[PDB]
């Protein structure tokens, strides 16, 4: 079992740089050509670059040309991806991967067989910001049968991610939606939960929101509309 | 570059059935076509190479055919682990190496109409100068759904959809309409109109600002 562990990703400003690392084990690193492939949120796999087993030949996707550099330190079993002059469109999950062996070693196979888990890269000029947590009050407009929906709007935060739990985890029925990147450059997500409408008096409902990047921790009580 | 286009985008099947996915190329790559399996945010897995050769450890239910610009991936006797995203890749004419846009294999189930709910902006938010109205579509199937905001009877937001529910394989959707408080107060009716195959007719969930 080939093991490819990536690191070095994170949040960076436009025009700045990052250098990803990919630690390999579980195979003879120095014998295999290596690749970097990226995947933007909700998009397809895009090849980035390739480098020979001995690091003597390289190829890049036009989009990263002159900005990215793929390299390797075989003594350390590490593959790198230098990423300079980053652009918003460079945001994606970056995977390092090895390709299969060729029979005569006259060139690359392009047979990408084992991939790493990926490291995320986010390019933005947004400043780290904690979320405002607003209640989504249960009401006659959020109830069906004996079930009422209530939730929390975790708005305007950067960067990803946030965690949301209900009643410190005591609460089935939770639907925490994928965050959404707003025009402002800030993220926003909603977490809704369905409960018995008969409990709106008897039970207090609190969403616990945490946004580690800004060290934000909020426990907002959600009360029935008034 | 050699552009790869897959079809269909989504395939609804249940265990035991047969999946047929196609991958077409803008120009020839000979038989140098690879098939991958991937789950969102996870490491892709090699399934088949050179159009029809199964990779080490890959089970017989996975087969491939085609050449040049027209390929087909077939998965018979579908098993739970097979529900994922499938990508084709070409290594016949590169650089650049190119991939298809992927085909998702979702769990099939019966039609389920969405339970539509609407939430006015909170008092806390309005204090700050903004107003977000939320429309929620709970547990529906299939995934396609037309969610349109109607303000005072006029067509206007951002939305996101959950993965198939762990229990009922349905989807849920959240749509947020955001306005400045000044604009929010100019209008009176806020509605979310939902068109979905599970409903014989569109559902409009509405509220009038300030109504008690």
């Amino acid at each position: 079992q080939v093991q490819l562990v990536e690191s070095g990703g994170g949040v960076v400003q436009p025009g700045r740089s990052l250098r990803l690392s990919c630690a390999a084990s579980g195979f003879t690193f120095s014998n295999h050509g290596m690749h970097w492939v990226r995947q933007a949120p909700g998009k397809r796999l895009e090849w980035v670059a390739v480098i020979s087993y001995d690091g003597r030949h390289e190829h890049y996707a036009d989009l990263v040309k002159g900005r990215f550099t793929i390299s390797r330190d075989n003594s350390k079993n590490t593959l790198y991806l230098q990423m300079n002059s980053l652009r918003a469109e460079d945001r994606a999950l970056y995977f390092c991967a090895r390709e299969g062996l060729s029979r005569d070693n006259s060139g690359f196979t392009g047979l990408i067989d084992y991939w790493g888990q990926g490291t995320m890269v986010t390019v933005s000029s947004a400043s780290t910001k904690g979320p405002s947590v607003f209640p989504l009050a249960p009401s006659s407009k959020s109830t069906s049968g004996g079930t009422a929906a209530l939730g929390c709007l975790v708005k305007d935060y950067f960067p990803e991610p946030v965690t949301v739990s209900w009643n410190s985890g005591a609460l089935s029925g939770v639907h925490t939606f994928p965050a959404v990147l707003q025009s402002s450059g800030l993220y926003s997500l909603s977490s809704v939960v369905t409960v018995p409408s008969s409990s709106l008096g008897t039970q207090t409902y609190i969403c616990n929101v945490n946004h580690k990047p800004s060290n934000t921790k909020v426990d907002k009580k959600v009360e029935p509309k008034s | 570059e050699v552009v790869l286009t897959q079809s269909p985008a989504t395939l609804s099947l249940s265990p035991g059935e047969r999946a047929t996915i196609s991958c077409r190329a803008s120009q020839s790559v000979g038989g140098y076509l690879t098939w991958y399996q991937q789950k969102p945010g996870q490491a892709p897995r090699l399934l088949i190479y050179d159009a029809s050769n199964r990779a080490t450890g890959i089970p017989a239910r996975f087969s491939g055919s085609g050449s040049g610009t027209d390929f087909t991936l077939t998965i018979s006797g579908l098993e739970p682990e097979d529900f994922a995203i499938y990508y084709c890749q070409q290594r016949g004419n590169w650089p650049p190496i190119t991939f298809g846009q992927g085909t998702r294999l979702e769990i099939k189930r019966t039609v389920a109409a969405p339970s539509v709910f609407i939430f006015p902006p909170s008092d806390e938010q309005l204090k700050s100068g903004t107003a977000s109205v939320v429309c929620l579509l709970n547990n529906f199937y299939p995934r396609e759904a037309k969610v349109q905001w109607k303000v005072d009877n006029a067509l206007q937001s951002q939305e996101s959809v959950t993965e198939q529910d762990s229990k009922d394989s349905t989807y849920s959707l959240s749509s947020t309409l955001t306005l400045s408080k000044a604009d929010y107060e100019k209008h009176k009716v806020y509605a979310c109109e939902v068109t979905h195959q599970g409903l014989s007719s569109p559902v409009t969930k509405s509220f009038n600002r300030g109504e008690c």
Partner: peptide, 10 residues
């Protein structure tokens, strides 16, 4: 390891 054809010469 499986052996593959080279598709891009050095």
């Amino acid at each position: 390891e499986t052996i593959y054809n080279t598709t891009l010469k050095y």
